[PDB]
Design a protein around this ligand. Structure first.
Ligand code: JZ2
Length: 162
């Protein structure tokens, strides 16, 4: 297991524009195109991201290319964030994957609501952190995925991903 395999499980792979769990146009392995309800705006974002006229469809290679860009940018964002970097750098590599996963899903603005969880994770109070993480819109809206990510934070193992 690694961050790519982990996010591939959690996000799936779809080659045509679809709506994510929040109703937002998306493609590939959880590549958000836009929060706009306008499908045309989404198609324009897709063409911009791929560099050709896609008419709402991409190939697996193209999906994986966006995925690599998206995972990388997520990590680099964490490292630039004064609130996130110290927590991230305190963690072992398996737990760092859980961190990347959560940021990939909800963005840094999403993880801003997790200040108390962050503190417990930095303190390595793993069961306490796991309890606090589940007290969230995140958990309630995507409980099966959040359970997997939280187990990863709690144990530092890949048990939740088989
Ligand atoms: C919970 C959590 C901790 C540390 C980082 Cl870097 C991200 C997270 O989404």
């Amino acid at each position: 297991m690694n961050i790519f395999e982990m996010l591939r499980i959690d996000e799936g792979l779809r080659l045509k524009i679809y709506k994510d769990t929040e109703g937002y146009y998306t493609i590939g392995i959880g590549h958000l195109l836009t929060k706009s309800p306008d499908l045309n705006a989404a198609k324009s974002e897709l063409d911009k991201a791929i560099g050709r006229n896609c008419n709402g469809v991409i190939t697996k290679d193209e999906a994986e290319k966006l995925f690599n860009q998206d995972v990388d940018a997520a990590v680099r964002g964490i490292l630039r964030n004064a609130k996130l970097k110290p927590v991230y750098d305190s963690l072992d590599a398996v737990r760092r994957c859980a961190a990347i996963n959560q940021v990939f899903q909800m963005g840094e603005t999403g993880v801003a609501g997790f200040t108390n969880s962050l503190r417990m994770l930095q303190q390595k109070r793993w069961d306490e952190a796991a309890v606090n993480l589940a007290k969230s819109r995140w958990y309630n809206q995507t409980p099966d995925r959040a359970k997997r990510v939280i187990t990863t934070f709690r144990t530092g193992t890949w048990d939740a991903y088989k």
